[PDB]
Ligand binder design. Structure first.
Ligand SMILES: NC(=O)C1=CN([C@@H]2O[C@H](COP(=O)(O)OP(=O)(O)OC[C@H]3O[C@@H](n4cnc5c(N)ncnc54)[C@H](O)[C@@H]3O)[C@@H](O)[C@H]2O)C=CC1
Ligand SMILES: NC(=O)C1=CN([C@@H]2O[C@H](COP(=O)(O)OP(=O)(O)OC[C@H]3O[C@@H](n4cnc5c(N)ncnc54)[C@H](O)[C@@H]3O)[C@@H](O)[C@H]2O)C=CC1
Ligand SMILES: NC(=O)C1=CN([C@@H]2O[C@H](COP(=O)(O)OP(=O)(O)OC[C@H]3O[C@@H](n4cnc5c(N)ncnc54)[C@H](O)[C@@H]3O)[C@@H](O)[C@H]2O)C=CC1
Ligand SMILES: NC(=O)C1=CN([C@@H]2O[C@H](COP(=O)(O)OP(=O)(O)OC[C@H]3O[C@@H](n4cnc5c(N)ncnc54)[C@H](O)[C@@H]3O)[C@@H](O)[C@H]2O)C=CC1
Ligand SMILES: c1ccc(CNCCc2c(CNC3CCCCCC3)[nH]c3ccccc23)cc1
Ligand SMILES: c1ccc(CNCCc2c(CNC3CCCCCC3)[nH]c3ccccc23)cc1
Lengths: 333, 333, 333, 333
């Protein structure tokens, strides 16, 4: 009778399909939408759900993505302020809450964003008890800890985007100096995604050539080439971009899509992401900060043990102390 | 104690992989390996299993693929003569059996390849009772029927690669004449993957312009442009390529990867593939042949009802009669 | 002496890059950045230049993209307010200018954006005399005409993004009703990217089945299924999304990346884009509006002639009249 | 008058198109066709030309690829025994000649394959004087030297596929031991693509952790974990695969596509490929062997200088001496 009934003959009985690689993005602001477009561009989701408290903005973002469906391979894009829309997600990316004002530390956002997370996180696990949560909201290390405590998920299923972005920036800036692709320039930023991050100069290399072996002063204040300035540029990068355009989003969206790719393709690639590091490098408390971690379909399955220089371990311990001083006073977790 | 124990600190205490996007290719001949490399190139499997009777060849192919892992996103590639290696496959591609000699009809392979399938199909469903089977071995329409009977699987989970390849050839040949990309030149080959195929000239179009409306003689024997010769070239293509290089493999490997993409990405794209067409176009028996079908993560869920011209319906019925003449005499299914 | 001199031994004594697959995006607003991220995600440029009048915002966007380099395959990302940065671009995407307020016609933007284009287009061709220009700013059909006049380029090198986006929206909405992928649901929106667009109901098809042959009332006011409402939703879509989120950007960014892919891959795929249609369907003036066009590495090399129904031709002529009424009064082009 | 003339209205004059990223594959054997399918799969060629002395096999391979065009983004696939078909190639991949029989050294193929190259290489440069040549035929290091002498091309435009494959195998075997993706396991095989290859144990690392710092005996005969066996497995791999399936092809096809991607995308990624190493590591003659090299659109533009252990330098010099002993006895280059 209907055009659809004239055109389409069933072979199978119409039955509810459960998606196999659903992704939710919580928060459809600058970061959440950069994450969404990068996930859709890399064909990483068979279903994409969006949540926000701004109902009109949310519906607009959902419709704009839906209009691009012809160019994508994501057959279902949905959005609602209600967390029921997020059911059966494999990965939930949390970008909701407040961002830095100009010259504001990420650590100054802690009380506001803890209050946002207190109501969101229990709803995420209610509807997707088997998900991995990727925390992006700042300060990302503290809010990964908070998400672990609120969610009751195992450690391997609560990941902070952490220093995957800082390390991308570091590798870009070193690769630009050397005239090579960042993928061929190896270097790790660890610890806090923020001012106390640690540059592991001792592991920086190109084709397995230690650059600190070529320039032993690399990373010190007594270096005629002032490589230390590259780590200062990594630390200052968010502040500089926020002064120019108000926020950052494109690089973090690609960084989050890189983490999702490793997990949904089950690759066991190593990324510097935020995890619980008690018992590593003499850290005595449940600090979350970035170390090199193996990521696959289970989540964050292992941490790489490193031989660090004394000044590197000292900076990592200082970063841990900086974060623990905030974590220890958090209430009702 | 081991280097691995020194380097890698567990976060998850468990290392077992849950079966997920596993594909098996049965047969490691020219077609099975083209299927395998196209599945790996398009990142369509997290686990690829190869099964075949030829143990040395199978191990060599497995090792050669494993050596390219750095360039791929498939973390597990395995191979064995025993079907236990195929356990918990979501899709199984069947390419094993005899192939055409020069000038040989695909229909002449039926007794030999039915005997191969009486062995193989029960082993597939023993180890993957919840799989989708894509049949590629020839004659593909008859062997799709045979696989359906032997497997006990529902219709929507047994698919013959069918005329997805014939249609690709048809679109290439018409697009070459018009100077456009085959993706912009729409045309359907239906029925037997073989000599009795149907060119649906009444549906051939560019930008929704019916080419038969522009040239009503298109596909008739009274056409000065002789468009009918294009269908003759589609029918003869396998024989011409077999005469020149001995077999065909690259285009069918890409065609199979196209079908898998629609299913694993859950897209509900329409392909001309082999399904059970009883009750369509006056067909009274359980004939399998190619019609436009919707493919998604459930398998083959719908068929498109078409308005055909009399000469199109007549060739489709002739195709069904040709195939049923062989099907009706099959024993012990 | 330097770490770079210690590490890197020249084989080639020269480092300059020969200009090749360079793309400029003019405008770093919502649309320019969606275009930029989609071009980078699809690896469509070896060099991306951003040009804009807002120097701080431009530098911030350039830095944010640069920080994602590790995740991309574009080795050079540059930005300046001076058009010297755009030199030797193969493709220039123009997204600069004013956009619609809530409820505002795209045609109300004409005087403002003609003033923008009178500055921008001469600067583009000064620095890239051999480029293809893709016009995105609204009203896109009028500004494609203005760009043709100001640039002195041949017709095949000046393209309006046009109805590629309207057609994607149309195919999304029809595919959603039928439960299929938009890539399997064929349908064309022609004429103005705006209120006077034409839905070619006579060409709408699935697997070469004309849907108007199944439902002759499709696209008329006397249709119990009211398929006409789908064309109304296409026309209203920009206004609805602007009401909800303030602007549109994701779908047009993907649409522009689709056009660039056809051209840089030299594919001769057909897209409904804005071109000079004098002499077509009795149009007597140099009107620009969308028809199905072949796109390849030369640009826009052909238009598809269509057999249209009387109501489709009537709307196309009305669309042409609507645009010519504005074009005829333009001065100093 | 013709259907094409009714359907397609010219905007531009029909003009001969010069491809911008044409690739030729010389030899359509097991390696040449693995190269071709990997190039087509990664969308690296707007035109693909095939050359072989076997005219029928060549035409059949061309047709089988053409039949897959709908699934590809390569609008022109051509093939001929005449090198005029290769004109205006950016990259020419040479796979032609004889391969190893079972247990045969690659070095034993040198006189036969030099005789093939003496005829081929002058014709390649005649028709594509601006190309990069990637040598794959064995013994690859000596034939890269021979191709340099015969071609008269600059060093940076003559590249041997070299140890890109050996290093992929090495990284796969180490990554399998550690349970990580090969892309996260860093290790270099240098020198001859063959029995005298050098494992740079001192540069092997995961996340910038030197594995030889964890196990100082790594690569010695006095190692309880016998990591040296992994290098033996790399050396023996081609022989083992040749014993099982007769040849190798899939891994080298993906390795060649990786080198092409770096060059056509202008990335300046580092690969261990065969280049002229006179003046490096006390090598006094025009030896070609693999070192880490930067690859971009210019070709092989730099070599990475490494700090190697004494035993590693000794092995590299022994590899150079092994290759020079063959190069010095070659006639009429
Ligand atoms: N980890 C990293 O590397 C980076 C983190 N960030 C962080 O990402 C977060 C988001 O930044 P933007 O997207 O630029 O901010 P934004 O202001 O553009 O968007 C934030 C969104 O969160 C929504 N939201 C607020 N409260 C909510 C609640 N209770 N439930 C649901 N949605 C809620 C808002 O309505 C808004 O749409 C910030 O915390 C920022 O500091 C930003 C850049 C990089
Ligand atoms: N549906 C389509 O469009 C196409 C179908 N084909 C069909 O694909 C099949 C495979 O072709 P190729 O790979 O070229 O053949 P091939 O000879 O290269 O490989 C045949 C494979 O099946 C195995 N096999 C052969 N005889 C067997 C037996 N008696 N029992 C168990 N395993 C056996 C072999 O060990 C080998 O792995 C043929 O039936 C051929 O007609 C070929 C091309 C296109
Ligand atoms: N063709 C299509 O399908 C679509 C077209 N558009 C059009 O794209 C254009 C850009 O929209 P958005 O990016 O959302 O706007 P936006 O306000 O976010 O960005 C506009 C950009 O143009 C620059 N610009 C503004 N006024 C200028 C002037 N007087 N001179 C020079 N540069 C100037 C701004 O600095 C900024 O870079 C608008 O004309 C809009 O109507 C919007 C969406 C889809
Ligand atoms: N560098 C590497 O890592 C690897 C190198 N190889 C080498 O690749 C080469 C090709 O191996 P396969 O493809 O397996 O051999 P194959 O025997 O399958 O194909 C070689 C092709 O070269 C053609 N040919 C012979 N002389 C020719 C000439 N004068 N002009 C044009 N074409 C000519 C033959 O007709 C044949 O089609 C061998 O030298 C082999 O050792 C193989 C694997 C990996
Ligand atoms: C002679 C001696 C040593 C070599 C090979 N050098 C490999 C050494 C190496 C380092 C340096 N590790 C530092 C060393 C100081 C102790 C504290 C921190 C760890 N980083 C890498 C990153 C990647 C690869 C290797 C390395 C060659 C010749
Ligand atoms: C019997 C008669 C005819 C057929 C199949 N006919 C397919 C025809 C067709 C149309 C309809 N064209 C219109 C109709 C006339 C009004 C003026 C404009 C042109 N659109 C398509 C889009 C795609 C493919 C085909 C078509 C089958 C059986």
């Amino acid at each position: 009778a209907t055009l659809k009934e004239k055109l389409i003959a069933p072979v199978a009985e119409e039955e509810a399909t459960v998606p196999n690689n659903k992704i939710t993005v919580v928060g459809v602001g600058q970061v959440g939408m950069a994450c969404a477009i990068s996930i859709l561009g890399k064909s990483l989701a068979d279903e994409l759900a969006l949540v926000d408290v701004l109902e009109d903005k949310l519906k607009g973002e959902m419709m704009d993505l839906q209009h691009g469906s012809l160019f994508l391979q994501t057959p279902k894009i949905v959005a609602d302020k209600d967390y029921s829309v997020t059911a059966n997600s494999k990965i939930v990316v949390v970008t909701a809450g407040v961002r830095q004002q100009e010259g504001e530390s990420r650590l100054n956002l802690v009380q506001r964003n803890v209050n946002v997370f207190k109501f969101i996180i229990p709803q995420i696990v209610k509807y997707s008890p088997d998900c991995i949560i990727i925390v992006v909201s700042n300060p990302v290390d503290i809010l990964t800890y908070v998400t672990w405590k609120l969610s009751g998920l195992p450690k391997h299923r609560v990941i902070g985007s952490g220093c995957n972005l800082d390390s991308a920036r570091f590798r870009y800036l070193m690769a630009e100096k050397l005239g090579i692709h960042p993928s061929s320039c190896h270097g790790w930023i660890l610890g806090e995604h923020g001012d106390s991050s640690v540059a592991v100069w001792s592991g920086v290399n190109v084709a397995g050539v230690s650059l600190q072996e070529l320039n032993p002063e690399m990373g010190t204040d007594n270096d005629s080439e002032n490589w230390k300035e590259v780590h200062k540029m990594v630390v200052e990068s968010a502040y500089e971009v926020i002064k120019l355009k108000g926020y950052t989003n494109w690089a973090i969206g690609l960084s989050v899509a890189d983490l999702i790719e490793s997990m949904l393709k089950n690759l066991s690639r190593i990324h510097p992401v935020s995890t619980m590091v008690k018992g590593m490098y003499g850290i005595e408390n449940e600090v979350f900060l970035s170390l090199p971690c193996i990521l696959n379909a289970r989540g964050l399955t292992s941490v790489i043990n490193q031989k660090l220089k004394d000044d590197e371990v000292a900076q990592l311990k200082k970063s841990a102390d900086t974060l623990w001083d905030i974590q220890k006073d958090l209430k009702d977790l």
